[PDB]
């Protein structure tokens, strides 16, 4: 497992540090006291350097002992290709991140139509991960798919798509009846509580925020990733004021790209 890899590389650097620090002790003692103007000042400098070197040796030995407490347990062509594959994969990950952070594309111009089967395959692929979210697709009105995403015992989100691109979302509480009299989805309602109206507003900013132009799978996957973080409503405190309640509201803002809780008044 990877923790053994990290502990072994850690303890490798611990041995190298121990050896170099012992040699540094004996090298600084080889040179002897320097001059340093004031006699009191030169004595102080020599004593301080020797003490620091000894302390560094002790720290390195202690760290090696701590890793010891925590440690657990033609053919060359294949390994060369394996190493070069991992190298290319990591290199490409870094270069792709650096380049798509800073794109120079200004406009798409130079000089939506999808089978519903594809939408069902995509959304079932999202539903296979996140075992606490269940997504139930239905199409009461044409090709525009409507999704009920239940989330723990916490949320019921009604997502109204339009050609495999999220359009509207409505977040209601668990007990709340999301169905009309006839058992269809109540696409147009609100949720009787202050908290879930705030989370509808935050979800509309979430669907306005996660916008790739072309590829919509990253959009729906990232929206569900962001939505999954709301399972710690009523349990997470705000990361600005520490408390749970500002004006009788839990922290309704799970921040994009770092899913942390905030009261929206604490931005």
């Amino acid at each position: 497992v990877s923790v053994n890899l990290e502990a072994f590389s850690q303890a490798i650097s611990a041995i190298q540090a121990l050896r170099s620090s012992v040699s540094r002790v004996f090298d600084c003692l080889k040179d002897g006291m320097r001059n340093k103007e004031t006699l009191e000042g030169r004595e102080k400098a020599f004593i301080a350097h020797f003490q620091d070197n000894l302390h560094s040796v002790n720290r390195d030995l202690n760290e090696l002992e701590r890793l010891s407490n925590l440690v657990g347990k033609l053919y060359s062509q294949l390994l060369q290709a394996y190493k070069w594959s991992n190298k290319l994969q990591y290199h490409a990950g870094l270069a792709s991140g650096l380049l798509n952070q800073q794109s120079l594309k200004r406009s798409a111009n130079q000089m939506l139509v999808l089978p519903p089967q594809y939408v069902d395959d995509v959304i079932s692929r999202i539903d296979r991960m996140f075992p606490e979210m269940s997504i139930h697709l239905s199409r009461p009105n044409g090709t525009s798919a409507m999704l009920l995403v239940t989330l723990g015992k916490v949320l019921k989100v009604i997502v109204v798509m339009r050609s495999l691109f999220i359009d509207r979302t409505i977040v209601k509480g668990y007990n709340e009846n999301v169905y009309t009299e006839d058992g269809k989805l109540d696409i147009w309602s609100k949720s009787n509580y202050q908290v879930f109206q705030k989370v509808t507003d935050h979800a509309t900013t979430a669907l306005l925020h996660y916008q790739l132009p072309q590829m919509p799978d990253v959009v729906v996957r990232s929206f569900m990733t962001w939505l999954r973080s709301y399972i710690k409503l009523f349990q997470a405190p705000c990361q600005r004021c520490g408390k749970f309640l500002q004006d009788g509201l839990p922290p309704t803002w799970r921040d994009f790209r770092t899913l942390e809780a905030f009261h929206d008044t604490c931005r």
Binding site: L112, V113, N141, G142, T143, S144, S163
Partner: protein, 39 residues
């Protein structure tokens, strides 16, 4: 009589819903073209 009239109603509503979806896609194209016009 009831079953025949229900089938006619369902045919009319399926036709209308498919019409709405096709018209909506055309409206999306026309909105992009009209709002992004330079003029």
């Amino acid at each position: 009589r009831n079953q025949q009239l229900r089938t006619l109603q369902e045919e009319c509503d399926r036709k209308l819903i498919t019409l709405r979806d096709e018209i909506s896609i055309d409206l999306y194209e026309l909105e992009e073209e009209y709002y992004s016009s330079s003029s």
